[PDB]
Write a protein that binds this ligand. Structure first.
Ligand SMILES: CC1=[N+](Cc2cnc(C)nc2N)CS[C@H]1CCOP(=O)(O)OP(=O)(O)O
Ligand SMILES: CC1=[N+](Cc2cnc(C)nc2N)CS[C@H]1CCOP(=O)(O)OP(=O)(O)O
Ligand SMILES: [Ca+2]
Ligand SMILES: [Ca+2]
Lengths: 675, 675
């Protein structure tokens, strides 16, 4: 049949792509081609408009199987061709070895690191539910799309998927339909060696619906029926168990050897002949398959055409909501939204930056409907919920509504991070955030790195940033954390010192379209600084205290800026004139012009950095570094600062030693380099 | 009764400790005191010998509840007193706000970061099973101890605990007995807001046995009976559901407010009077409670006395095994074990450092019985299994035996990391390792940081270290990873360049007693270097190519050392004389004498670092840094190196620019500093 021919085409495109690269993963593509065919036939999408907001989304969580995804995209006429498939895994191609949303049309997210994609799918589905609850009206199903996820045994072993699956079940996300490639093979061989749990029983325990397809190597009727069944269960996410043979059709089917290396040439020949293809030909695309797939595309395009008319009618019937929706689909924030950002003066009281963050959120959430967010069981500590908002929960629970704006993630940092990526991936200008203690952002490193690689504007509200948290002690006190994330490409790591800097950090985080943000915020109160403003802090680094005859400049962040200002006064009594630079975000600063940066960190003066955590990275901006390169301590925070000499006198002593060390030396800016 | 009085004593010590600190967590201690009393009465331990190898182990995974643990340790006469309890959460005390194994006698592991302790318990139990299988003989139950773990809702939400619980069920770890504090309250309030899964059904799906105790606020008979029942189920770990009231007895019992802040003074008064204590007194220890607990200690000490005689008889009956066991309990490796380390010459073939690692393991595993390890589903990629070894599996599976030495962790990096910590915590000189790709060590950051804080000699075999892995692309290629771990205190991060350096890295990792190791290893082949040796590489950094008239020194690691040597030849043709330093471990290097370090990185010569990942940290050792501060690419590895100019010519160009940049300048070693 044409469907059988399409499945064979998919299988053979994937195998031929792996063969041409002499690299990659043929096994799962062979096993999942029937399911991919069936799912894409049920999906609504436009290959010519990858951003249609009511499209169904597909996520390949087992991203190593991407030759399958690329084959589907090529067959459906996305902006990806057979010539691109021939360049699978080749430098610069549109067909990288794992899918990247920035590079691959039709890749919703970046997968490959196992477990992430299913969590991203949870976030896409969460966003769709929130979006539909916000905009849909009687006779106006603006949003009614599904989220389809393929995942394998490896994703099911990764703890992040357990976190997200528990939460998705709790949230009753009935438009999420996941498909488990139950092939009983991973890299180390049979799943009997390490993965003998009853997966189905576990998913039932989370509140998921289950459909089992016992012969998913051939039974596309049953796969389609499983989708239909899943769509009837509106209050549970569904897991479809696809019992498949890894590498189906290969001489090596059902073995670990077919997972992750190219097939032998003779194996490819026998695949082709038993499926009616020419064993001498590669990258064959039968025109009847193209015709069948084109029919589905044309039908989907007529569905989108009708959706566009529905949207036009919605704008007439609901003028305010329609204009809001249009603005969001255009990627634009509300005009002058930033006038809601709080502004402070040096006469205002000291405030912890976690509390300043609460105040910002309280002002901007009512002004910017596309902001949603939550916390990983730290709501009253991170201060992430605006008073008067309702939680995102299924209304059946009585605990919230899908129109709610605040997500109770539970103690699930890693899944929170990957769910945030999925919310961003949904689109519609969502600007979403997640709170935890800074030290436990590290639990989510796998997802955070993907936020950076995927260019998603997510925000971590990362409170209790240092030894300033005090008594909880060294298991809770960051040392390495900012260095880790600052060393990751494309992460803005804001460590605001005061009220104006906290508003600048949020302005950056909410305006972002391609860069994730981490906001490192204090437990403890900090003074409002003389010289701070949103305008200056928006440059990422700025001169707080200018001293034209400086003997030294002290560059600091966060809680240490006020310390530097106090040290400047001690130094004056020692006959040393200091300037102060505040560096609330190194990435934003780095992006400023060379001339601006040199105005902040000039030649001809020693520069000392002060920040109560690792000194890594700081030599970009300073000649000498005063940091904390050992673990912390359990005690009252002021006593810990005293112990480690992060006091005005301790900073002054090191500043004086720095001045002494450079006597008789020629000093150029740390910004200079040889290449 | 005296048991009731003991439970009240525990509760009130914990509340009084929190009160004195005006900080900490009274709720879970109040709820878990009956269970703690019951469990410690069943446990075999010696407060005067915390390292008795056949002790039962206790782990408080909900580490915020540590006022409970400290109260137990004080009451049982560990080296912790009421005076220490009065200093709970105070700087420098033996009672920090979360338990630290380095600081607290009777704390087996460092907990506080949720989810870790239960995984550590899995590792303690895994080690006990392996140890017993190795040493026990008929009439000689050298090892027969249990592992008791307390955990709460937060631990059950963290994905790492799902990973470890799936694996523990698979491994049939019948001497593991965990207790869930089922109190339905977390920081964000009721668990109904985020955690509605059927936990018991999930644990059954993993193959655990379940016992439910419906009134764990009072029913110590049922808690004791649950332990007895668990001990009869020898082929499943057991989860005991303790249905408790958080803060039991407090006016605020059953509320989130009792989780994490001191009780009100009037609340403490009413607690004391209803339990028969003096509301005017704090830190009361009734002598009858001390007497009862002392009776149990005395019985346990007689059990250990008899174990010592059993061990003496074992040494006579099994002379070889007895001497091996004695050596391990003394903390000593086999005499001259390191003579098994492979040694290479520059005439030997190029080899990937992952393969060199395989060869090391193949030589040392037969020589050092306390080495065990595994991989997170990457055995044929990391090359972590020695041929001829058997896997650690329950014999009932037919897939291995508990005497086996190789662990199939599955796709569970985070749990692998925390399980490794538990294996180390067991003691008996275990030197254990875990393989994954370097980029996915990041999934386990929560546990890795705890390896460092806990001072455990665990080893990550972290292969595929860079863009040198090629086609899998940027989702797999480390950039920030070494900077992250090097910025963490107390992590040795070895990046060996060749065969001799790989042997030095293992010598360090296996000899370690207090420092975790990460071995960053290549996919791709590297040449054997002229000038390398185990002796020199053991210094962490060394002069590979000495040039007395150097215009520049190039410092490099791993795959970039050979690149630097090739660049030296290009530079010679440009009239520039270079030296080369290899820096296989920055931590080990840092620990050398100042004079040694200056002999490697002298004054008076520009120093350029070369390493194909983040430049963070490198200014400790260099004036200029050539690194990779952007994400990678999917293609053949040599083409990626060419793209980023990590070629002999690209390094030479930057070296020449470095020489030019320092013309006319006075250059001092990067090792110099102002303070
Ligand atoms: C272990 C593995 N990798 C390394 C890998 C490890 N850890 C993380 C976080 N991401 C990864 N990418 C890549 S791939 C995988 C086997 C998957 O086994 P799985 O059953 O899902 O795939 P398959 O056999 O094809 O049915
Ligand atoms: C969310 C929380 N903390 C921050 C916290 C967050 N993430 C990680 C990895 N470790 C932590 N330490 C500390 S504590 C916890 C509530 C526990 O809730 P749980 O039900 O286990 O404790 P309890 O209410 O006392 O019954
Ligand atoms: Ca599989
Ligand atoms: Ca709880």
């Amino acid at each position: 049949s044409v469907d059988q021919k399409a499945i064979s085409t998919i299988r053979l495109l994937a195998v031929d792509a792996v063969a041409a690269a002499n690299s990659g993963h043929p096994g799962a593509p062979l096993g999942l081609a029937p399911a991919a065919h069936a799912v894409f036939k049920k999906m609504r999408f436009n290959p010519k408009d990858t951003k249609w907001i009511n499209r169904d989304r597909f996520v390949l969580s087992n991203g190593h199987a991407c030759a399958l995804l690329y084959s589907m995209l090529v067959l459906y006429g996305y902006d990806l061709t057979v010539e691109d498939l021939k360049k699978f895994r080749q430098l610069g191609s549109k067909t990288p070895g794992h899918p990247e949303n920035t590079d691959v049309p039709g890749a919703e997210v970046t997968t490959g690191p196992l477990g992430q994609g299913i969590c991203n799918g949870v976030g896409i589905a969460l966003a769709q539910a929130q979006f539909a609850a916000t905009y849909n009206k009687p006779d106006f199903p603006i949003s009614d799309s599904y989220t389809y996820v393929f995942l394998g045994d490896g994703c099911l072993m990764e703890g992040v998927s357990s976190e997200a699956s528990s939460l998705a079940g709790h949230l009753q996300l009935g438009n999420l339909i996941a498909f488990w490639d139950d092939n009983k093979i991973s890299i180390d061989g049979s799943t009997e060696v390490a993965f003998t749990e009853d997966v189905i029983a576990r998913y039932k325990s989370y509140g998921w619906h289950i459909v089992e397809v016992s012969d998913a190597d051939t039974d596309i009727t049953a796969i389609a029926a499983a989708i239909d069944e899943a769509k009837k269960v509106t209050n549970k996410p569904t897991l479809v168990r696809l019992t498949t043979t890894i590498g189906f059709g290969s001489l090596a089917q059902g073995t670990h050897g077919v997972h992750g290396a190219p097939l032998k040439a003779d194996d490819i020949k026998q695949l082709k002949t038993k499926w009616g293809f020419n064993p001498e030909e590669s990258f064959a695309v039968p025109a009847e398959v193209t015709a069948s797939y084109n029919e589905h595309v044309a039908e989907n395009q007529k569905i989108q055409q009708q959706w566009n008319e529905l949207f036009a009618a919605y704008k007439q019937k609901y003028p305010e909501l329609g204009a809001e929706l249009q603005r969001r689909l255009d990627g634009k924030l509300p005009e002058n939204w930033d006038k809601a950002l709080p502004v402070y003066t040096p006469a205002d009281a000291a405030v912890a930056t976690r509390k300043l963050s609460e105040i910002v959120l309280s002002k901007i959430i009512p002004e910017v409907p596309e902001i949603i967010g939550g916390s990983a069981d730290l709501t009253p500590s991170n201060l992430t919920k605006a008073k008067g908002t309702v939680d995102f929960q299924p209304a059946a629970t009585g605990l919230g509504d899908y129109s709610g704006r605040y997500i109770r993630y539970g103690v699930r940092e890693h899944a929170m991070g990957a769910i945030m990526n999925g919310i961003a991936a949904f689109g519609a200008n969502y600007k979403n955030y997640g709170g935890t203690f800074l030290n436990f952002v590290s639990y989510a490193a796998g997802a955070v790195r993907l936020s950076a690689l995927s260019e998603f504007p997510i925000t971590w509200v990362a409170t209790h940033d240092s030894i300033g948290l005090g008594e909880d002690g060294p298991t809770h006190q960051p040392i390495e954390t900012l260095a880790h994330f600052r060393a990751t490409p494309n992460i803005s790591v804001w460590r605001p010192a005061d009220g104006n800097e906290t508003s600048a950090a949020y302005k950056s985080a909410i305006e972002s379209t391609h860069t994730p943000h981490i906001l490192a915020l204090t437990r403890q109160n900090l003074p409002q600084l003389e010289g701070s403003s949103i305008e200056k802090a928006s440059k990422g680094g700025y001169t707080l205290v200018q001293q034209d005859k400086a003997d030294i400049i002290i560059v600091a962040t966060g809680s240490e800026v006020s310390l530097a200002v106090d040290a400047l006064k001690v130094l004056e009594g020692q006959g040393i004139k200091a300037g102060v630079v505040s560096l609330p975000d190194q990435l934003t600063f780095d992006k400023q012009s060379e001339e601006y940066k040199l105005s902040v960190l000039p030649d001809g003066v020693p520069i000392l950095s002060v920040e109560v955590m690792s000194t890594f990275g700081w030599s970009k901006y300073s000649h000498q570094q005063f940091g904390l390169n050992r673990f912390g301590a359990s005690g009252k925070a002021p006593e810990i600062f005293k112990l480690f000499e992060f006091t005005p006198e301790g900073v002054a002593e090191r500043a004086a030693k720095t001045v002494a060390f450079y006597k008789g030396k020629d000093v150029v800016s740390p910004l200079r380099s040889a290449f």
